[PDB]
Amino acid sequence: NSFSGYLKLTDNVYIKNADIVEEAKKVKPTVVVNAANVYLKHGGGVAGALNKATNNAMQVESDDYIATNGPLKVGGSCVLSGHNLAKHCLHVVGPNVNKGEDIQLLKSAYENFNQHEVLLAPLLSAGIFGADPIHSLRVCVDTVRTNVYLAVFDKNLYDKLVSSFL
Ligand SMILES: COc1ccc([C@H](NC(=O)c2ncnc3[nH]ccc23)[C@H](C)c2nnn[nH]2)cc1
């Protein structure tokens, strides 16, 4: 958990302008959060990048989990191996509001982070899922009580978040 160059936003929320994959390789955190979908099909975004950095080992393990357990629910999670990136990967499903899923489930999604003392994570429900990323950071700050290190890859978004927050 050797995090460096983060800006502290609250007592338990830190932020850095970085690619979450590069952070995972350097830090080797106990937990890396994936912004997953209910079938754990890691096709793009954070999920595609984390899976690519495991050389598809994350996808093979995710397919076996879905065969035995079935899909996750929106707002839910599962803990699987972190492979070469972390001890564990916490796969979390935020609502896709562009497909009618309720924005109140974004609070349920961030509540999963509270089972882990320290996490490396992206913002949930942003991008193709349609939630406003500044609103997603406000839900994170109001829901997560354990120590979260947020990696924001787009510098333009990182600057908007830091301006809106502090
Ligand atoms: C569907 O769920 C999401 C949830 C996060 C997002 C976007 N995050 C990423 O795609 C991302 N974040 C950190 N490291 C990364 N490495 C490769 C991709 C990547 C949001 C918009 C964003 N942009 N810049 N920082 N965060 C897109 C969709």
Query: Residue ranges of the domains in the chain?
Result: 1-165
Euclidean distance between CA atoms 63 and 67, whole angstroms: 6
* DSSP per position, 33-72: EEE--TT----SHHHHHHHHHTTTHHHHHHHHHHHHH-PP
Nearest to 62 by CA among 89, 23, 95, 93: 89
State the Cα–Cα distance between residues 134 and 90, nearest whole angstrom: 22
CA torsion through residues 33, 150, 11, 129, sign: negative
Find the length of the chain: 166
Q: What is the DSSP letter of 123?
A: P
Question: Which ligand 1 atom lies nearest to the CA of residue 129?
Answer: 1
Cα(111) to centroid(ligand 1), Å: 19
Retrieve residue 93's tokens: 């499903």
The CATH code of the domain at 1-165 is: 3.40.220.10
CB 23 within 8 A of CB 158: no
How many other CB atoms are there within 10 angstroms of residue 59's CB atom? Answer: 19
Q: What distance in Å separates the CA atoms of residue 150 and residue 99, rounded to the nearest whole number?
A: 25
Q: Please, what is the end-to-end C-alpha distance for the chain in angstroms?
A: 25
Pocket of ligand 1 (CB under 6 A): 19-21, 35, 45-46, 49, 122-129, 133, 151-154, 157
Nearest residue to 79 (alpha-carbon basis) of 58, 105, 107: 58
As a whole number of angstroms, the distance between CA 69 and CA 60 comes to 14
In whole angstroms, what is the distance from residue 126 CA to residue 129 CA?
Answer: 6
Contacts of 158 (CB under 8 A, 6+ apart): 15, 17, 152
Residues 75 and 93 sit within 8 Å (Cβ to Cβ): yes
List Cα–Cα distances, 136 to 43, 47, 107, 160, in angstroms: 22, 18, 9, 13
Measured between alpha carbons, how far is 18 from 129 in angstroms, rounded to an integer?
21
In which element (H, E) is residue 4 found? none
Atom of ligand 1 nearest to the CA of 20: 14
Residue 74 to residue 143: CA distance in whole angstroms: 17
Resolution of the experimental model, in Å, one decimal: 1.2
Residue nearest (by alpha carbon) to ligand 1 atom 19:
46
For residue 101, the Cα-to-chain-centroid distance in whole angstroms is 18
Q: Can you state the percent helix, strand and coil of the chain, rounding each to 5?
A: 40, 20, 40
With residue 136 as reference, give the H or E element that holds it.
helix 133-143
Ligand 1 centre distance from Cα of residue 132 (Å): 12
Task: Report CA-CA distances (Å) from 63 to 40, 56, 151.
Answer: 7, 11, 26
Ligand 1 atom at minimal distance to the Cα of residue 35: 2
**Ligand 1 center to 19 CA (angstroms):** 9
Q: Are strands 7-8 and 13-17 parallel, antiparallel or unpaired?
A: antiparallel
